[PDB]
Design an enzyme around this catalytic site. Structure first.
Site, short mmCIF file in Angstrom:
data_model
loop_
_atom_site.label_atom_id
_atom_site.label_comp_id
_atom_site.label_asym_id
_atom_site.label_seq_id
_atom_site.Cartn_x
_atom_site.Cartn_y
_atom_site.Cartn_z
N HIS B 25 47.37 17.62 39.61
CA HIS B 25 46.06 17.50 40.24
C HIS B 25 45.24 16.40 39.57
O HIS B 25 44.63 16.62 38.52
CB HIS B 25 45.33 18.84 40.10
CG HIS B 25 46.06 19.99 40.71
ND1 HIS B 25 47.16 20.58 40.11
CD2 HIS B 25 45.84 20.68 41.85
CE1 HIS B 25 47.58 21.58 40.88
NE2 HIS B 25 46.80 21.65 41.94
N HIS B 260 43.20 15.82 45.66
CA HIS B 260 43.06 17.13 44.99
C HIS B 260 44.30 17.53 44.18
O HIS B 260 44.20 17.88 42.99
CB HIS B 260 42.74 18.25 45.98
CG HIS B 260 43.06 19.61 45.44
ND1 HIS B 260 42.26 20.25 44.52
CD2 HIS B 260 44.14 20.41 45.63
CE1 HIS B 260 42.82 21.41 44.18
NE2 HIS B 260 43.97 21.52 44.84
N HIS B 472 40.05 56.97 46.97
CA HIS B 472 39.88 57.08 45.49
C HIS B 472 41.13 57.56 44.74
O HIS B 472 41.28 57.27 43.54
CB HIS B 472 38.76 58.07 45.17
CG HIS B 472 37.38 57.51 45.39
ND1 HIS B 472 37.00 56.94 46.58
CD2 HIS B 472 36.30 57.46 44.58
CE1 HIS B 472 35.74 56.55 46.50
NE2 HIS B 472 35.29 56.86 45.30
C1 LIG Z 1 34.83 49.55 44.20
C2 LIG Z 1 34.14 50.83 43.74
N1 LIG Z 1 33.77 50.97 42.45
C3 LIG Z 1 33.16 52.07 42.03
C4 LIG Z 1 32.92 53.13 42.91
C5 LIG Z 1 32.20 54.39 42.36
N2 LIG Z 1 30.81 54.39 42.88
C6 LIG Z 1 30.44 54.99 44.04
S1 LIG Z 1 28.75 54.70 44.31
C7 LIG Z 1 28.57 53.78 42.84
C8 LIG Z 1 27.30 53.11 42.30
C9 LIG Z 1 26.02 53.47 43.02
O1 LIG Z 1 25.99 52.61 44.12
P1 LIG Z 1 24.82 52.75 45.17
O2 LIG Z 1 25.25 52.22 46.50
O3 LIG Z 1 23.55 52.06 44.55
O4 LIG Z 1 24.63 54.35 45.26
P2 LIG Z 1 23.36 55.14 45.91
O5 LIG Z 1 22.05 54.51 45.60
O6 LIG Z 1 23.70 55.18 47.48
O7 LIG Z 1 23.45 56.65 45.47
C10 LIG Z 1 29.82 53.73 42.23
C11 LIG Z 1 30.02 52.98 40.90
C12 LIG Z 1 33.34 52.95 44.25
N3 LIG Z 1 33.17 53.91 45.16
N4 LIG Z 1 33.93 51.80 44.64
C1 LIG Z 2 42.28 32.71 43.05
C2 LIG Z 2 42.91 31.40 43.54
N1 LIG Z 2 43.06 31.14 44.86
C3 LIG Z 2 43.61 30.01 45.32
C4 LIG Z 2 44.05 29.03 44.40
C5 LIG Z 2 44.66 27.69 44.94
N2 LIG Z 2 43.62 26.62 44.75
C6 LIG Z 2 43.57 25.81 43.65
S1 LIG Z 2 42.20 24.73 43.74
C7 LIG Z 2 41.72 25.38 45.28
C8 LIG Z 2 40.51 24.95 46.12
C9 LIG Z 2 39.80 23.70 45.64
O1 LIG Z 2 38.87 24.14 44.71
P1 LIG Z 2 38.04 23.09 43.90
O2 LIG Z 2 37.65 23.66 42.57
O3 LIG Z 2 36.76 22.66 44.80
O4 LIG Z 2 39.07 21.85 43.72
P2 LIG Z 2 38.72 20.34 43.25
O5 LIG Z 2 37.50 19.79 43.91
O6 LIG Z 2 38.68 20.35 41.66
O7 LIG Z 2 40.04 19.51 43.57
C10 LIG Z 2 42.62 26.40 45.62
C11 LIG Z 2 42.46 27.17 46.94
C12 LIG Z 2 43.88 29.33 43.03
N3 LIG Z 2 44.27 28.46 42.10
N4 LIG Z 2 43.31 30.50 42.64
O1 LIG Z 3 32.75 57.22 43.72
C1 LIG Z 3 31.98 57.67 42.59
C2 LIG Z 3 31.22 58.93 42.99
O2 LIG Z 3 29.81 58.77 42.83
C3 LIG Z 3 31.77 60.16 42.25
O3 LIG Z 3 32.57 60.78 43.23
C4 LIG Z 3 30.72 61.20 41.77
O4 LIG Z 3 29.70 60.61 40.94
C5 LIG Z 3 31.37 62.38 41.02
O5 LIG Z 3 31.79 62.02 39.70
P1 LIG Z 3 32.83 62.93 38.85
O6 LIG Z 3 34.22 62.76 39.38
O7 LIG Z 3 32.64 62.52 37.31
O8 LIG Z 3 32.38 64.48 39.00
O1 LIG Z 4 52.76 21.31 47.24
P1 LIG Z 4 51.98 22.72 47.38
O2 LIG Z 4 52.66 23.81 46.64
O3 LIG Z 4 51.76 23.01 48.96
O4 LIG Z 4 50.49 22.48 46.79
C1 LIG Z 4 50.34 21.79 45.55
C2 LIG Z 4 48.97 22.08 44.90
O5 LIG Z 4 47.99 21.55 45.84
C3 LIG Z 4 47.30 22.67 46.42
O6 LIG Z 4 48.03 23.25 47.52
C4 LIG Z 4 47.18 23.62 45.25
O7 LIG Z 4 46.23 23.03 44.36
C5 LIG Z 4 48.59 23.56 44.66
O8 LIG Z 4 48.55 23.86 43.26
#
Ligand SMILES: Cc1ncc(C[n+]2csc(CCOP(=O)(O)OP(=O)(O)O)c2C)c(N)n1
Ligand SMILES: Cc1ncc(C[n+]2csc(CCOP(=O)(O)OP(=O)(O)O)c2C)c(N)n1
Ligand SMILES: O=C[C@H](O)[C@H](O)[C@H](O)COP(=O)(O)O
Ligand SMILES: O=P(O)(O)OC[C@H]1O[C@@H](O)[C@H](O)[C@@H]1O
Ligand SMILES: [Ca+2]
Ligand SMILES: [Ca+2]
Lengths: 663, 666
Positions: B25, B260, B472
């Site tokens: 790159h 790129h 979950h």
């Molecule tokens: C990806 C993910 N991480 C963690 C949880 C556990 N979880 C459920 S609600 C919550 C945080 C509270 O979120 P919010 O939407 O502000 O709850 P509310 O105010 O509705 O009670 C978490 C950590 C989940 N369900 N999904």
């Molecule tokens: C999580 C993830 N998804 C996809 C890629 C493949 N990839 C490498 S660079 C790029 C997009 C270009 O990003 P940018 O930082 O704007 O590149 P640059 O301008 O430095 O060439 C992608 C999709 C990756 N390395 N990691």
């Molecule tokens: O997804 C997270 C939820 O809020 C939990 O289900 C809830 O807080 C209950 O927690 P615990 O499993 O510790 O009783």
């Molecule tokens: O020749 P491929 O594998 O299609 O791509 C080469 C590189 O160019 C972009 O696709 C990504 O950055 C990858 O690492």
């Protein structure tokens, strides 16, 4: 009844059902009840009698822990969700699981619980509506015209996936997407200021959203005005900043983390009834309240009006109307099977050594004219994943298109695609390098859980990608997909297996299909008619011997050629060897036992698996008395040829491992 | 030489190295060369002769595809990275792999390539510096004082993880974090406007960052002024929006997606030399340019001054200094092994039927006073994951604390923790429900790849969590971890195995350790002294018979209790049975052949695995002639006890399946 009384019905049902279950989340349902009352009673276009009505608004509870909110709404408005089901909240096989699930509960649009994915799904549903409208609407015939409403909380806002999908939603000017942010200042750890201080309104304005600040989430007039303003903005998705009190109504637990995720307790519930002036016993709703909540009459009027509109459309545009019905039902074109088989047969008859990523593109090209429902894309890897065909039209350029530039958003892309599949009318495909399935991993699982058709195009599948090295070279990712319930995973060995896998993917009705594709060129294998037909069975005998084999190679993808070379060497020595190509373990496993026995006879224990992926997976087919030529480490940065040599993907090593078994 | 000439040295080495490899790159290195020249030559506090200097600034290349940028910098400034290595870019076993890797290239701070994780790591490194300074600095002795600089591009900005870590960095007011955004308008699909239209400045202002807009990324003076501004702002992390031309120098490929990710081509390189006025042949750098780039003398001076500062600190604060040195080296307290063993022995002698999440909290409580290096946290699940102990203090409350409220940010949390482990001085632990490891999955892999010590506390490990239901309830997640190279995964069956796993995790210097912990109470098992010691061997005989077993149960976590019950039933009926507890498959696999044979003798084929997780995993230990009592589907929303019944986790079913197996064998 007053609007607050109507909203209080949600509060009562929610706190009471949680209490009865001794499990669940009363806070958010209580905090959002007034917002829900305005949205559902004044705006939501829906028919409880037909949750599948093609043109209904879609509602999504992204803060899905507040499941009693949606169950209260569905029950009160007249969906097929009786009080007994609310009384069985969180109980085995009820229609009221702890987080809402699409598929058995009438009116539930998607399965939430994993924070952030609901809003992603909503973005997908709004993309689907906008695209379907552009494709099907004709002057005087606007048969697609519906909103996508989402509720979301601090948890969804904190999650990275919210940034991915809300950014893209702004770019795509999704004017019919309206999100309500439950701005209650509380998460599980307590007051959110210790860990979450975004100026969320400013953030969303940065995405090109229309943002309405400082809504009193407990005032019907405030909420209603804000929704009117949002609906008036047609060129931007809208975020409504709804200030609410979690557990609203509870004197001692309102505004506290205590109300988030546990029953309030009988004493607190009694105090809540007093504070709310709610006079009804648990699971008692008076007739006047049902009368104001019920949506059956309005719902049927709206749907019937739409049916009449569709009939007029079908008169003027019969072919288009037929396509709309077919696509909304997720049905395949009647001649697709025959046409795809013809393509597959052509490839077998006309050998080409190309990368399976290229074979994938070729299948897209063949299928494109046949499947106008395609809504495909790549996470900023179009020229590498090879997801464009001659007919690709990007929806940022042409609203009636069939291609999405998802940007570098693997997780958002996949959950958006879940929204697209859930909406109806489309067949989404998504794509990135296989390694980065790990970024999207829970959305992939969610597609499987929700039984959704989506083709996941994962290229650069092994050390065969070469110089990008160990951060990019998959080793263990395929194995993880293979053990995912209801996932289909195909690792085709040439252009013919690639087409069969693509066909299997688009014809799946009840789950997603991951395609495991190479960067590097793959040799085409010769096949008899029987072998060609058996590719679709997931595993088949590719090379054989007379009588019971003494040795069986089981190989996938890029390693089939290697296995065949080992087979030739051993066959020439007089070993009774066989090669089994195993493009899909899941499709193989689903075969009848006679077929499976014909491919992997139970008496033949001398089995050698060959795959440039994690070795441990293969004990499933080789048991304790076989061998595995696989990976046991991360990769290395070097040219592919040298990597295959370094890691033991050589004829000599495969032959040596096989000879070790035959003693 | 002019600053542009010095920056062009990077452009030349980068395009030429990519060309020789016929892979890589050139775009980002060519676009960011002027920024790199200012940052490295004018600001970066570092010593090429000691890449491990405790108080060095940390640099992170989040847009890691531009790996030749960092190799050029390390080579030019005088690190142990000879020209021969640049000539071996992207070649087997070179010190110049296609994406930079921590460990075997002097001066590389972290492994990037997966977009977004670099900036996460940087946030971790900044948190580490802030916390370490708060813990160790004393009046007149500021022994911790360094910046964290990160480069990042459009890919990193689009990724969700950038939102998680930059949001949190704003909350924590990380004044010594300074990020440079390579704002070049190009990604792989082409001009970014088709898919990326954020007002990125406004977004970062929403996070509480100090943003500097419209920096001419090809003007040294402009870049320098911007860095000085960012350095003057002490209470917010800074983002410098650097407008650059990708592939700067290439007449035909600059400003295009073509620059790129593929070699420019020999013809184009010739034209680029002409445009840049760069006369030197590939891999040729004149002595006068080295003289201006080299950092050995300045580096040595800065480190020596710091060594004097540390010596004075050691005089005034000898205990604190000894702790700083110990912790920066990642060494364990000398008495930790003995004290932890005492704790474990106490647990075995004093049974308690508690959830392994509680057992985990108890181990944190026991280890906390012994491991001041702990920097632990949970992704908004402190009261559920049970990550707080009595001595926890949140760093948003007191900067000298040891606990991080990560918010609902599993991926950001884990990649931040990788930054913390990479920095030195701390032992991070992180936590969420096991299901949501899937949100953080590639950061977990990156910890393993980078050989980093981090304890990953994953509670609510199965259908045993009950009512929250299938979104979950883990099924296939443990198997996913078990097949990850260099991952360690422990699924302890009681409070004793839990303590052993925790000890194993904190003492594991060369990779991460995931703890798979229950919501529900787990029975304590009886153990001899020998069995107690054998827990750490990953798999061991828990119950046995005289002579060769006709049946071996292999069980983990919450299912060992069930397996033991089945073993008792069968034994009473005269069946010769054994129970193996397998808390860690990876540790077991690492034992020698003789030990593994002793536990799972090859003669015994009638093997029954019992685990509330995906069944397909277990063919590894049961082969084709055993049985598996596992999960083959998603879960369901119901009380845990009803789910265990529904899914066949009952004594009657385990016994039945075992007998059915034996009938088939007979
Ligand atoms: C990806 C993910 N991480 C963690 C949880 C556990 N979880 C459920 S609600 C919550 C945080 C509270 O979120 P919010 O939407 O502000 O709850 P509310 O105010 O509705 O009670 C978490 C950590 C989940 N369900 N999904
Ligand atoms: C999580 C993830 N998804 C996809 C890629 C493949 N990839 C490498 S660079 C790029 C997009 C270009 O990003 P940018 O930082 O704007 O590149 P640059 O301008 O430095 O060439 C992608 C999709 C990756 N390395 N990691
Ligand atoms: O997804 C997270 C939820 O809020 C939990 O289900 C809830 O807080 C209950 O927690 P615990 O499993 O510790 O009783
Ligand atoms: O020749 P491929 O594998 O299609 O791509 C080469 C590189 O160019 C972009 O696709 C990504 O950055 C990858 O690492
Ligand atoms: Ca909240
Ligand atoms: Ca860019």
């Amino acid at each position: 009844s007053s609007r607050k009384e109507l909203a209080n019905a949600i509060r009562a049902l929610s706190m009471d059902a949680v209490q009865k279950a001794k499990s669940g989340h009363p806070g958010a349902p209580m905090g959002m009840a007034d917002i829900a009352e305005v949205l559902w009673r004044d705006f939501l276009k829906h028919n409880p009698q037909n949750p599948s009505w093609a043109d209904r608004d879609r509602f999504v509870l992204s803060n899905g822990h507040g499941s009693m909110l949606i169950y209260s709404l569905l029950h009160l408005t007249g969906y097929d969700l009786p009080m007994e089901e609310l009384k069985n909240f969180r109980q085995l096989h009820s229609k009221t699981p702890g987080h809402p699930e699409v598929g058995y509960t009438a009116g539930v649009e998607t399965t939430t619980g994993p924070l952030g994915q609901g809003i992603a799904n909503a973005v997908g549903m709004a993309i689907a509506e906008k695209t379907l409208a552009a494709q099907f609407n004709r002057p005087g015939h606007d048969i697609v015209d519906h909103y996508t409403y989402a509720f979301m909380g601090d948890g969804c806002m904190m999650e990275g996936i919210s940034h991915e999908v809300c950014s893209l939603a702004g770019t795509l000017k999704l004017g019919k997407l309206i999100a309500f942010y439950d701005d209650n200042g509380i998460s599980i750890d307590g007051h959110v200021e210790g860990w979450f201080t975004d100026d969320t309104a400013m953030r969303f304005e940065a995405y090109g959203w229309h943002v309405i600040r400082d809504i009193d989430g407990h005032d019907a007039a405030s909420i209603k005005r804000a929704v009117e303003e949002a609906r008036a903005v047609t060129d931007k998705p809208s975020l409504l900043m709804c200030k609410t009190i979690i557990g609203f109504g509870s004197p001692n637990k309102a505004g506290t983390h205590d109300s988030h995720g546990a029953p309030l307790g009988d004493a607190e519930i009694a105090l809540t009834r007093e504070q709310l002036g709610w006079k009804y016993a648990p699971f008692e709703i008076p007739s006047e309240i049902y009368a104001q909540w019920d949506a059956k009459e309005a719902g049927q009027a709206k749907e019937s009006a739409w049916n009449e509109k569709f009939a007029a459309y079908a008169k003027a545009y019969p072919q288009e109307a037929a396509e709309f019905t077919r696509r909304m039902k997720g049905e395949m074109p009647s001649d697709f099977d025959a046409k795809a088989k013809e393509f597959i047969a052509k490839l077998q008859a006309n050998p080409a050594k190309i990368a399976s990523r290229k074979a994938s593109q070729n299948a897209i090209e063949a299928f494109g004219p046949l499947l106008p429902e395609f809504l495909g894309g790549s996470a900023d890897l179009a020229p590498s994943n090879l997801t464009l065909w001659s007919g690709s039209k990007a929806i940022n350029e042409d609203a009636a298109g069939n291609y999405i530039h998802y940007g570098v958003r693997e997780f958002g892309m996949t959950a958006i695609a879940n929204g697209i599949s859930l909406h109806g009318g489309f067949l989404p495909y998504t794509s990135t390098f296989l390694m980065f399935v790990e970024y999207a991993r829970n959305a992939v699982r969610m597609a499987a859980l929700m039984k959704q058709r989506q083709v996941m195009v994962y290229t650069h599948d092994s050390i065969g990608l070469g110089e990008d090295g160990p951060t990019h070279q998959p080793v263990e990712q395929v194995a993880s997909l293979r053990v995912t319930p209801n996932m289909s995973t195909w690792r085709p060995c040439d252009q013919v297996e690639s087409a069969v896998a693509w066909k299997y993917g688009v014809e799946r009705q009840d789950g997603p299909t991951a395609l495991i594709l190479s960067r590097q060129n793959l040799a085409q294998q010769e096949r008899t008619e029987e072998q060609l037909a058996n590719i679709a069975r997931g595993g088949y005998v590719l090379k054989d011997c007379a009588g019971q084999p003494e040795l069986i190679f089981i190989a996938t993808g890029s390693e089939v050629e290697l296995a065949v070379a080992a087979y030739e060497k051993l066959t020439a020595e007089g070993v009774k060897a066989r090669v089994v190509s195993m493009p899909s373990t899941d499709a193989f496993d689903k075969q009848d036992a006679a077929y499976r026995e014909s491919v992997l006879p139970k008496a033949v224990t001398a089995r050698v698996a060959v795959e440039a992926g994690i070795a441990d997976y293969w004990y499933k087919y080789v048991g304790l008395n076989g061998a595995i030529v696989g990976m046991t480490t991360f990769g290395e940065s070097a040219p592919a040829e040298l990597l295959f040599e370094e890691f033991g993907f050589t004829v000599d090593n495969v032959v040596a491992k096989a000879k070790e078994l035959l003693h």
